[PDB]
């Protein structure tokens, strides 16, 4: 079976076995939907290293890796003898014949964003920094500027989704588009990603766990980087989701997709909380740097000489020339140095 | 007639002194009216008018009333008293108008860059100006009955450095500030248009009524002074028009002093 | 005359967020300043935030990102969205309207304030 938004039904209904990318079944370790298999050495043996190291998390084996899938930049013959090698030159072939995807799920669409530096959960020190989300880098600002724009150049539509861009190219419409291993069922030649501002682009790499194509798959992989396995991910997506919706729609600019996107991704800030920052960074875009930088101070807030008196009636103590003389005075205002009498 | 001219011009300097003092009184007693850093030069130009209802205008008047000047060796510091006044209040005005400009473009500059401090050293640059271009031709025999006219070019300095200068301030500081009020107004009447003048209209008939009022008080006399030592005018005429700039003195505070504070003021004082 | 109504004060817990209305009757020039204000027992009256007509915005040092203002264009209406409210932000918060109707000077209106509680 495969019922639709399996990776949002699952968690409700926890299935015998589940396939589908490994960012999603870090979440499901965290609250203990799957169960901890005991692998042999059989099977590891059988399998590479990378992908046991992806599916990897908290030095726990959690489910056998599948198949590796990427995003590769799928173009019609026919249409275009040679793919174009920058996103800056795609605009003009467009507007010379008249690139088409999903522009609903943020999958397809961040490999353009990460293109020009975005990233998000740095891996720094062999280590996810959950703290350090840079989705609101130049980078991202850049790629999501770029998408916008194209979006409102009459380029892509800002409704469709992966069966229309299917049906478009596989009848001929649309000239190229980015698909992975998944489409060449159903459908040419396959190459890589356009480089954007000159910077390669970073798609994300998806294992899944319980010839020219592979070789344009497997060097958009390597091209990239693999997702994380932090139980985040599960909103993160959502966030990004979210701009997307909030940014190729036109209901908002950048910055403010952005600014969304970094207050979702925070999981500490309650509801209350959450709209609060909401409402302020809508009626007020010009601070909304400040009000990002007080929401990560407020994350990590909610995050779970002496004298000696020995005289017939003043007997006792108290606190080299210059203490001398003071001492002396002392004992003569009154009536280790030790003074008897 | 001359009874009459007499009793116009006791009139006009007694409103004149009782102004002055209405907003003297208004300013030094009640502390919310002091609080605000402009009103340090609305003061400051009350008090220049409150000189000139006291050393400028009494001593012309009894003097036009003799019919010349019977106070011998007094006409030289007479008109070095009657020019510091003039300059003083004339920069006073460009001084209020150029801070009204600095609050209305930039007010969140204005009020951390507009201090207390600001004030009183720009009050003292021009009463010192004042001073300066009064005082030191006067003594230095520099502007050579007292009805002598003025030099050629001292005349040209005196008013150039008093009024065009200032003219222009001010005419530039008016135009930037009913630009931007068209901007602004423009803008909500566009938002109203496509939700669903008067308020222009206003703005320049207060303009109009503050620029054009200071001018025809004060630019025919400097065009006289100017035109005279070249010289084709009797001296009656000249009096006529420069009995303007000194009534303007007066006329001032009912403009720059008559808002909603003074007449709150005003109203539970007396 | 202007009348300034102000409301959304009230209790809240430390760290929780609100939002303070205040409503503006009457005839305002189209150059106005609305800002907010606090002020303490015992202490003075300090700047809260500000805008101006044309959308310029100011806070102050000790709340910048903290709270945000803004205005209804069309109805001249100020909201002030307030996060992160620490106990010592209990005050009366005060709406003024800064109105240069006459260019040579400025009127101020207020509302009288409405009281804010965080709690600890």
């Known amino acids: 079976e495969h019922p639709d938004k399996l990776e949002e039904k699952f968690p409700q209904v926890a299935p015998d076995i589940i396939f589908w990318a490994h960012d999603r079944f870090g979440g499901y370790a965290q609250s203990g939907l799957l169960a901890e298999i005991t692998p042999d050495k059989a099977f590891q043996d059988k399998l590479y290293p990378f992908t046991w190291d992806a599916v990897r998390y908290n030095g726990k084996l959690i489910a056998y890796p599948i198949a590796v899938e990427a995003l590769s930049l799928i173009y019609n013959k026919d249409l275009l003898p040679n793919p174009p090698k920058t996103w800056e030159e795609i605009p003009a072939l467009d507007k010379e014949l008249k690139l088409m995807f999903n522009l609903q799920e943020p999958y397809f669409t961040w490999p353009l964003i990460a293109a020009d530096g975005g990233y998000a959960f740095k891996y720094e020190n062999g280590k996810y920094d959950i703290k350090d989300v840079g989705v609101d880098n130049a980078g991202a600002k850049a790629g999501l500027t770029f998408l916008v724009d194209l979006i409102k150049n009459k380029h892509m539509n800002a409704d469709t989704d992966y069966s229309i861009a299917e049906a478009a190219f596989n009848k001929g419409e649309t000239a190229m588009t980015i698909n992975g291993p998944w489409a060449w069922s159903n459908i040419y030649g396959v190459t890589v990603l356009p480089t954007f501002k000159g910077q390669p682009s970073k798609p994300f790499v998806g294992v899944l766990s319980a010839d020219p194509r592979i070789a344009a798959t497997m060097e958009n992989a390597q091209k990239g980087e693999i997702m994380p396995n932090i139980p985040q991910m599960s909103a993160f997506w959502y966030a990004v989701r979210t701009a997307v919706i909030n940014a190729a729609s036109g209901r908002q600019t950048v910055d403010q997709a952005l600014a969304f996107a970094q207050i979702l991704i925070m999981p500490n800030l309650t509801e209350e909380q959450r709209n609060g920052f909401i409402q302020s960074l809508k009626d007020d875009p010009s601070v909304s740097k400040e009000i990002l930088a007080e929401a990560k101070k407020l994350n990590e807030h909610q995050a779970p000489y002496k004298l000696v008196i020995n005289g017939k009636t003043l007997k006792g103590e108290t606190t080299a020339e210059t203490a001398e003389k003071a001492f002396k005075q002392y004992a003569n205002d009154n009536g280790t140095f030790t003074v008897t009498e | 007639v001359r009874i009459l001219t007499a009793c116009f011009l006791s009139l006009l300097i007694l409103s004149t002194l009782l102004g002055n003092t209405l907003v003297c009184a208004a300013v030094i007693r009640f502390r919310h009216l002091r609080s605000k850093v402009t009103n340090f030069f609305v003061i400051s130009l009350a008090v220049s008018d409150l000189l000139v209802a006291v050393l400028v205008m009494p001593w012309k008047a009894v003097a036009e009333i003799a019919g010349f000047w019977p106070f011998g060796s007094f006409c030289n510091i007479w008109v070095a008293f009657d020019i510091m006044c003039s300059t003083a209040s004339i920069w006073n005005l460009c001084v209020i108008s150029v801070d009204r400009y600095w609050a209305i473009s930039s007010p969140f500059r204005y009020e951390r860059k507009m201090t207390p401090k600001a004030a009183f050293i720009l009050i003292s640059v021009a009463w010192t100006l004042s001073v300066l271009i009064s005082f030191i031709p006067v003594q230095l025999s520099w502007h050579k009955n007292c009805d002598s006219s003025l030099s050629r070019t001292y005349a040209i300095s005196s008013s150039v450095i008093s009024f065009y200068i200032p003219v222009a301030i001010m005419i530039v500081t008016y135009t930037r500030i009913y630009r931007i009020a068209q901007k602004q107004i423009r803008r909500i009447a566009a938002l109203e248009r496509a939700a669903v003048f008067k308020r222009e209209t206003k703005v320049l008939k207060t303009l109009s009524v503050i620029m054009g009022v200071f001018v025809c008080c004060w630019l025919p006399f400097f065009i006289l002074n100017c035109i005279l030592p070249f010289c084709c005018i009797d001296s009656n005429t000249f009096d006529v028009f420069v009995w303007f700039g000194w009534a303007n003195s007066a006329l001032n505070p009912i403009i720059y002093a008559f808002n909603a504070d003074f007449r709150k003021a005003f109203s539970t004082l007396l | 005359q202007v009348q300034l109504q102000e409301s959304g004060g009230g209790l809240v817990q430390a760290g929780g967020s609100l939002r303070l209305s205040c409503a503006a009757s009457?005839?305002?020039?189209?150059?106005?300043?609305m800002g907010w204000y606090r002020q303490a027992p015992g202490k003075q009256r300090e700047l809260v935030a500000a805008?101006?007509?044309?959308?310029?915005?100011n806070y102050a040092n000790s709340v910048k990102g903290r709270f945000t203002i803004s205005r209804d264009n069309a109805a001249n209406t100020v909201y002030l969205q307030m996060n992160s409210l620490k106990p010592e932000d209990t005050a009366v918060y005060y709406c003024?309207?800064?109105?240069?109707?006459?260019?040579?000077?400025?009127?101020?209106?207020w509302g009288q304030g409405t009281q804010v509680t965080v709690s600890s």
């Open positions: 003024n309207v800064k109105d240069f109707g006459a260019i040579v000077a400025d009127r101020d209106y």
């Open positions: 009457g005839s305002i020039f189209a150059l106005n300043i």
């Open positions: 805008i101006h007509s044309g959308g310029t915005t």
